[PDB]
Nucleic acid binder design. Sequence first.
DNA 1: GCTGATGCGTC
DNA 2: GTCGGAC
DNA 3: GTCCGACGACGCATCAGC
Length: 641
Amino acid sequence: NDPSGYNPAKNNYHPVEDACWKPGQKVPYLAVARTFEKIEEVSARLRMVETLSNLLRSVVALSPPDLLPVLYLSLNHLGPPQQGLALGVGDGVLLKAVAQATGRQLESVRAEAAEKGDVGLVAENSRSTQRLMLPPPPLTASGVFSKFRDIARLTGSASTAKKIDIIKGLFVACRHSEARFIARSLSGRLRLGLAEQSVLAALSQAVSLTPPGQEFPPAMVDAGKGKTAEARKTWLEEQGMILKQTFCEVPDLDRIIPVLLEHGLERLPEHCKLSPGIPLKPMLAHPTRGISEVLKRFEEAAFTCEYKYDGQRAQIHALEGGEVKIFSRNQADNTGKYPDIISRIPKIKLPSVTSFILDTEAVAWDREKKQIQPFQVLTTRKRKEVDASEIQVQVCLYAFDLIYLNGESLVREPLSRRRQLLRENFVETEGEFVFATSLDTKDIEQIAEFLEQSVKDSCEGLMVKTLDVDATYEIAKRSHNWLKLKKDYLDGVGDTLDLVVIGAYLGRGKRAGRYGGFLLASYDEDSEELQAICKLGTGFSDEELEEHHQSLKALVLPSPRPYVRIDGAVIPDHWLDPSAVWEVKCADLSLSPIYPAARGLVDSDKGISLRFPRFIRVREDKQPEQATTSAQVACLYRKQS
DNA sequence: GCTGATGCGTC
DNA sequence: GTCGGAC
DNA sequence: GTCCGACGACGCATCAGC
Ligand SMILES: *P(=O)(O)OC[C@H]1O[C@@H](n2cnc3c(N)ncnc32)[C@H](O)[C@@H]1O
């Protein structure tokens, strides 16, 4: 009755009798917040899915128009990714709004949020000074979702103040745990332990057990009750795969949910199908730590090795009639930023090609020296809408897959055929569009040599893909069907540095109550100063991270040492007496606009930082004076050539 | 009209 | 992007 | 193996402050 007592984790949950609102009423936001509470309290994904499914079943049975907003709230998304809605709110705006809503000084709010590792706990445990004696009406799920979208659409001068007004308005109306999850959503850290795959599982379960479109009151609130547990499990798995394969081809809830409510899940693939112009989920890669692990994973299946190019994924759609769209790995519209690519499409496809979807890597290309350029150069291209004459950094497309051709979806076709269609129907032009360099072999010596060659040829390593056995493009069956093999995955291979710990950052979320990250430095011999080089936040086990907290607590300083230079780096929450030296691995070294390490040795204005740094081990046997020097950092950077 | 801080989207 | 935790 | 969320560097786009 009262949503404060809503229990979507209840045994024998009844979508009508155990809901906390009446038929046709708007889903209360507190119903969603209580569902989030029950999800965050458990560690078993399957239990989270069951709890979310219970909420969704009540939404279907009682208030179907609120299904879409509740789903977006559970994902902390604003809409389909290709539409590009973004809150434009981060911790800065959010903390100011919290401080204003609660009438507290910003620095008190900021300090509390850092100590607690969560803005939600700060917003929830303080009253709002704007509340009247009688509170405003309870928040609804659709109302909150619409206010999030209101925030996202505010743009231009003075828009921040307007966003804050909306946020404060939400907090004034919050009850019980609502402010916790409003704040977490706005900060982008809902951190339920449940995300896209679990939401899809909950959704297919919900609409299977409680079909949409029933005359009220629904005659069928639990369509699994007549089945054995075994038969029910098989049925829910099959229905889950129908939703998942459709979603992977059309990852757009605005399209799927109306179809689901009107026609049901079994008819879904007849209404939502892969098509050029609608972005799809890309195939991802599993990191593989050696050629021996490749063979263990693929066993006897024939596979191909391809250079792993160091650029940005570009999913290129050519629609029947000639329109071209380009999407990112995360279904964002990138059409506007590749006018050069769009103008070259007639040049890459044979005239018999009427439509396609290509999987490519966009790589920065130096036309004067005719060679690949680093990722850093690629990222200096403009974004959003770009006219063709603005292009300064040229791009070469390295094509490696073909997902659709002349009206045929290739999702269920083996790579051997997809690749043959790619190779035969498209045209290579050096420095503009070329097929990924590849090798079909099972010889370990050739693969190892090919990996070495890929690095010499300006690539990150190898992608490995089966050709015929489990070699389709069905993301719903396995999203990480390809293997990525990089030299820095191998123990003893790659650049490891010994770096000095000079600061620590309080942890957030799963790291709340300990350190979440650390500031590291190299030793500049010429100035006898430690220079910040990067932050570090992955590579340690939970046990190692607790050990770090124990070993570093005695090194906390109230002020920095005068021989430690960090320039523009984020000031650590705790300064540390330089003493601990850690072994750190990276994929590459980058020219940094922030970090002072080795500034002046390779570039006059820019120091050097680490790409993909991770903790390996503590160097008990090293003092800071024996850490990697800034001169050694510069030498490492130069030999990347 | 310019700049620094911040958000967001790439890896 | 890398990584470790929970299942 | 899957799923998830801790955390990394970087640069364009945006907007408050000037
Ligand atoms: P991530 O580091 O997980 O690796 C996957 C991405 O690598 C890029 N890529 C470059 N070259 C290839 C080939 N030949 N095949 C597949 N993927 C490649 C893509 O942008 C992936 O997203």
